[PDB]
């Protein structure tokens, strides 16, 4: 079969190459980063709802969920936030990814560290510290649900995927050495340590 691939621009490639090919001890920061993006996405739709309450539609509860899958060996971070359009995905948020990436790479070279990734709005890329493949399912009110996928290596795909009423689901396929992010105690301790700074409830899926 045939697949259609988009190419990451130079900046994103440089950042991903750094994240993937360099040893970093504090990989655990990825969770906080993904939860930060979710909280910001909830804020955007919440800001829109202030003038027009119908933007929330059938999904009023603005929530962040952390869901491990021990069978498929994946970690999901989902939200009922603003969501992303085909355009946001195809373009990789365009200028915001390139600007954040140039400034972050600059910060790193000048004394900044990987833990500061989120301060540059590029925190999503920290997923690549623990994941070998990242799948981003998203749905915005103005568009249909689409799936962004990248195993890095300069390319990504954006496929039409119905259907998540509004928001984003980020599925991380964890690396063999990163299976600790499937353990309940690990995720609990990490989510608790960060929930104190997130203005939305963070749901962790627990093992029955
Ligand atoms: C498009 C991506 C697949 C690839 C990308 O590059 C990238 C970046 C960037 F690096 F650009 F900043 N950030 N980023 C990302 C990742 C999680 C979310 C969330 N869970 O909502 C998100 N929300 C944007 C929705 C649009 C905005 O108006 C407001 C918040 C963005 C992604 C996901």
Short mmCIF file of C-alpha atoms and ligand atoms in Angstrom, two decimals:
data_model
loop_
_atom_site.label_atom_id
_atom_site.label_comp_id
_atom_site.label_asym_id
_atom_site.label_seq_id
_atom_site.Cartn_x
_atom_site.Cartn_y
_atom_site.Cartn_z
CA UNK A 1 0.00 0.00 0.00
CA UNK A 2 0.76 3.75 -0.31
CA UNK A 3 1.11 6.20 2.56
CA UNK A 4 1.40 10.04 2.28
CA UNK A 5 4.25 11.58 4.37
CA UNK A 6 4.92 15.18 5.46
CA UNK A 7 8.48 16.36 6.20
CA UNK A 8 9.33 18.11 9.48
CA UNK A 9 11.14 21.38 8.97
CA UNK A 10 14.92 21.59 9.91
CA UNK A 11 14.26 23.10 13.44
CA UNK A 12 11.92 20.24 14.60
CA UNK A 13 14.40 17.69 13.17
CA UNK A 14 17.29 19.26 15.18
CA UNK A 15 15.25 19.20 18.38
CA UNK A 16 14.00 15.61 17.86
CA UNK A 17 17.55 14.42 17.00
CA UNK A 18 18.81 16.01 20.29
CA UNK A 19 15.95 14.53 22.44
CA UNK A 20 16.35 11.02 20.85
CA UNK A 21 20.18 10.68 20.51
CA UNK A 22 21.26 12.27 23.80
CA UNK A 23 21.16 10.63 27.23
CA UNK A 24 18.99 12.61 29.68
CA UNK A 25 18.49 11.16 33.18
CA UNK A 26 15.32 13.16 34.02
CA UNK A 27 13.04 11.65 31.25
CA UNK A 28 9.97 11.75 33.66
CA UNK A 29 9.36 15.45 32.82
CA UNK A 30 7.42 14.32 29.64
CA UNK A 31 4.22 13.70 31.66
CA UNK A 32 4.08 17.22 33.17
CA UNK A 33 4.73 18.67 29.65
CA UNK A 34 1.90 16.76 27.98
CA UNK A 35 -0.48 17.63 30.92
CA UNK A 36 0.59 21.31 30.56
CA UNK A 37 -0.43 21.30 26.84
CA UNK A 38 -3.77 19.70 27.79
CA UNK A 39 -4.42 22.41 30.49
CA UNK A 40 -3.59 25.18 27.95
CA UNK A 41 -5.99 23.51 25.40
CA UNK A 42 -8.77 23.48 28.11
CA UNK A 43 -8.00 27.18 28.82
CA UNK A 44 -8.43 28.17 25.11
CA UNK A 45 -11.85 26.48 24.80
CA UNK A 46 -12.80 27.86 28.29
CA UNK A 47 -11.87 31.40 27.10
CA UNK A 48 -14.06 30.91 23.97
CA UNK A 49 -16.97 29.61 26.17
CA UNK A 50 -16.97 32.89 28.15
CA UNK A 51 -18.56 34.78 25.19
CA UNK A 52 -20.26 31.79 23.44
CA UNK A 53 -21.26 28.87 25.81
CA UNK A 54 -22.17 26.70 22.76
CA UNK A 55 -18.47 26.06 21.93
CA UNK A 56 -18.57 23.42 24.72
CA UNK A 57 -21.61 21.78 23.12
CA UNK A 58 -22.23 18.29 24.50
CA UNK A 59 -18.78 18.23 26.29
CA UNK A 60 -18.85 20.76 29.21
CA UNK A 61 -16.43 18.92 31.50
CA UNK A 62 -12.92 20.16 30.86
CA UNK A 63 -10.76 17.23 32.03
CA UNK A 64 -7.23 15.72 31.53
CA UNK A 65 -6.89 11.87 31.60
CA UNK A 66 -3.74 9.76 31.97
CA UNK A 67 -4.45 6.21 30.68
CA UNK A 68 -1.80 3.41 30.62
CA UNK A 69 -2.32 0.30 28.41
CA UNK A 70 -0.26 -2.59 29.82
CA UNK A 71 -1.23 -4.92 26.89
CA UNK A 72 -0.31 -2.59 23.97
CA UNK A 73 2.49 -0.97 26.08
CA UNK A 74 1.22 2.61 25.53
CA UNK A 75 0.62 5.74 27.67
CA UNK A 76 -2.27 7.98 26.72
CA UNK A 77 -2.66 11.62 27.75
CA UNK A 78 -6.10 12.90 26.69
CA UNK A 79 -8.08 16.12 27.11
CA UNK A 80 -11.45 17.77 26.31
CA UNK A 81 -9.60 20.98 25.33
CA UNK A 82 -9.84 23.08 22.17
CA UNK A 83 -8.55 20.35 19.84
CA UNK A 84 -6.58 20.76 16.58
CA UNK A 85 -7.76 21.11 12.93
CA UNK A 86 -6.29 19.21 9.93
CA UNK A 87 -4.29 22.46 9.25
CA UNK A 88 -2.82 22.62 12.83
CA UNK A 89 -1.63 18.98 12.41
CA UNK A 90 -0.43 19.13 8.75
CA UNK A 91 1.54 22.34 9.54
CA UNK A 92 2.76 21.20 13.04
CA UNK A 93 1.27 24.46 14.47
CA UNK A 94 3.58 26.17 11.92
CA UNK A 95 5.47 29.14 13.27
CA UNK A 96 4.94 28.24 16.95
CA UNK A 97 6.85 24.99 16.64
CA UNK A 98 9.74 26.66 14.64
CA UNK A 99 9.92 29.73 17.02
CA UNK A 100 9.83 27.62 20.21
CA UNK A 101 12.33 25.18 18.81
CA UNK A 102 14.87 27.96 17.72
CA UNK A 103 14.57 29.67 21.14
CA UNK A 104 14.74 26.34 23.13
CA UNK A 105 17.83 25.08 21.19
CA UNK A 106 19.32 28.57 21.92
CA UNK A 107 18.45 28.31 25.67
CA UNK A 108 20.06 24.82 25.82
CA UNK A 109 23.28 26.09 24.15
CA UNK A 110 23.35 29.03 26.61
CA UNK A 111 22.83 27.18 29.94
CA UNK A 112 19.16 26.21 29.83
CA UNK A 113 18.19 22.59 30.20
CA UNK A 114 15.71 20.01 28.83
CA UNK A 115 13.39 20.47 31.87
CA UNK A 116 12.63 24.03 30.60
CA UNK A 117 11.18 22.73 27.28
CA UNK A 118 7.61 23.82 28.17
CA UNK A 119 8.71 27.43 28.76
CA UNK A 120 9.21 27.59 24.93
CA UNK A 121 5.83 25.99 24.08
CA UNK A 122 7.55 22.95 22.48
CA UNK A 123 7.04 20.58 25.47
CA UNK A 124 5.06 18.11 23.25
CA UNK A 125 8.45 16.96 21.80
CA UNK A 126 9.56 15.68 25.29
CA UNK A 127 7.27 12.70 24.47
CA UNK A 128 10.27 11.49 22.37
CA UNK A 129 12.38 11.08 25.58
CA UNK A 130 10.24 7.99 26.47
CA UNK A 131 8.36 7.13 23.19
CA UNK A 132 9.57 5.68 19.86
CA UNK A 133 6.23 6.59 18.15
CA UNK A 134 3.66 9.27 19.10
CA UNK A 135 0.06 9.26 17.74
CA UNK A 136 -1.99 12.48 18.12
CA UNK A 137 -5.76 12.09 17.58
CA UNK A 138 -7.49 15.44 17.77
CA UNK A 139 -10.87 16.98 17.08
CA UNK A 140 -11.69 20.71 16.90
CA UNK A 141 -15.27 22.13 16.52
CA UNK A 142 -14.42 23.74 13.13
CA UNK A 143 -13.07 20.42 11.66
CA UNK A 144 -13.29 16.55 11.55
CA UNK A 145 -11.09 14.29 13.70
CA UNK A 146 -7.62 13.68 12.25
CA UNK A 147 -4.61 11.64 13.33
CA UNK A 148 -1.01 12.93 13.30
CA UNK A 149 1.65 10.20 13.68
CA UNK A 150 5.48 10.26 13.80
CA UNK A 151 8.18 7.69 14.64
CA UNK A 152 10.59 10.68 14.10
CA UNK A 153 13.15 10.28 11.26
CA UNK A 154 12.10 13.52 9.55
CA UNK A 155 8.52 12.51 8.66
CA UNK A 156 4.96 12.53 10.01
CA UNK A 157 1.50 11.53 8.66
CA UNK A 158 -1.92 13.20 8.95
CA UNK A 159 -4.86 10.83 8.28
CA UNK A 160 -8.67 11.47 8.39
CA UNK A 161 -9.93 9.49 11.38
CA UNK A 162 -13.55 9.70 12.60
CA UNK A 163 -14.27 9.81 15.75
CA UNK A 164 -13.71 12.00 21.04
CA UNK A 165 -16.33 14.82 20.78
CA UNK A 166 -13.64 17.63 21.11
CA UNK A 167 -10.03 17.72 22.29
CA UNK A 168 -6.78 15.77 21.89
CA UNK A 169 -5.66 12.15 22.62
CA UNK A 170 -1.81 11.69 22.60
CA UNK A 171 -0.80 7.98 22.50
CA UNK A 172 2.80 7.31 23.37
CA UNK A 173 4.27 3.99 22.33
CA UNK A 174 6.89 3.62 25.07
CA UNK A 175 10.49 2.52 24.38
CA UNK A 176 11.57 -0.92 25.86
CA UNK A 177 13.65 0.81 28.64
CA UNK A 178 10.68 3.18 29.51
CA UNK A 179 7.99 0.59 30.62
CA UNK A 180 8.01 2.12 34.14
CA UNK A 181 5.51 4.74 32.86
CA UNK A 182 2.89 1.96 32.74
CA UNK A 183 3.24 1.34 36.58
CA UNK A 184 0.44 2.85 38.69
CA UNK A 185 2.54 4.01 41.69
CA UNK A 186 4.95 5.78 39.23
CA UNK A 187 2.13 7.66 37.45
CA UNK A 188 0.31 8.47 40.72
CA UNK A 189 3.40 10.02 42.34
CA UNK A 190 4.15 12.01 39.13
CA UNK A 191 0.54 13.22 38.60
CA UNK A 192 0.11 14.18 42.30
CA UNK A 193 3.43 16.14 42.28
CA UNK A 194 2.02 18.21 39.24
CA UNK A 195 -1.77 18.40 39.89
CA UNK A 196 -1.12 21.16 42.49
CA UNK A 197 -0.33 23.50 39.52
CA UNK A 198 -3.10 22.46 37.10
CA UNK A 199 -6.51 24.11 37.31
CA UNK A 200 -8.30 20.99 35.97
CA UNK A 201 -8.87 17.53 37.44
CA UNK A 202 -6.34 14.94 36.31
CA UNK A 203 -7.84 11.47 36.03
CA UNK A 204 -5.51 8.46 36.19
CA UNK A 205 -6.93 5.10 34.95
CA UNK A 206 -6.45 2.51 37.66
CA UNK A 207 -6.05 -1.31 37.29
CA UNK A 208 -9.11 -3.33 38.33
C1 LIG B 1 0.71 19.51 16.13
C2 LIG B 1 1.49 18.51 16.93
C3 LIG B 1 1.10 17.10 16.46
C4 LIG B 1 2.93 18.70 16.61
C5 LIG B 1 3.54 19.91 17.20
O1 LIG B 1 4.54 20.48 16.72
C6 LIG B 1 2.93 20.46 18.44
C7 LIG B 1 3.27 21.62 19.27
C8 LIG B 1 4.34 22.64 19.12
F1 LIG B 1 5.55 21.98 19.15
F2 LIG B 1 4.07 23.29 17.97
F3 LIG B 1 4.16 23.71 19.89
N1 LIG B 1 2.40 21.74 20.34
N2 LIG B 1 1.55 20.64 20.13
C9 LIG B 1 0.52 20.33 20.92
C10 LIG B 1 0.47 19.13 21.65
C11 LIG B 1 -0.62 18.85 22.50
C12 LIG B 1 -1.79 19.74 22.51
C13 LIG B 1 -2.99 19.35 23.32
N3 LIG B 1 -3.07 18.22 24.08
O2 LIG B 1 -3.91 20.08 23.19
C14 LIG B 1 -1.72 21.05 21.71
N4 LIG B 1 -2.72 21.93 21.76
C15 LIG B 1 -2.67 23.15 21.05
C16 LIG B 1 -3.81 23.22 19.98
C17 LIG B 1 -3.61 24.50 19.09
C18 LIG B 1 -3.26 25.80 19.91
O3 LIG B 1 -4.05 26.94 19.44
C19 LIG B 1 -3.52 25.61 21.43
C20 LIG B 1 -2.94 24.25 22.04
C21 LIG B 1 -0.56 21.25 20.97
C22 LIG B 1 1.79 19.83 19.02
C23 LIG B 1 1.17 18.58 18.42
#
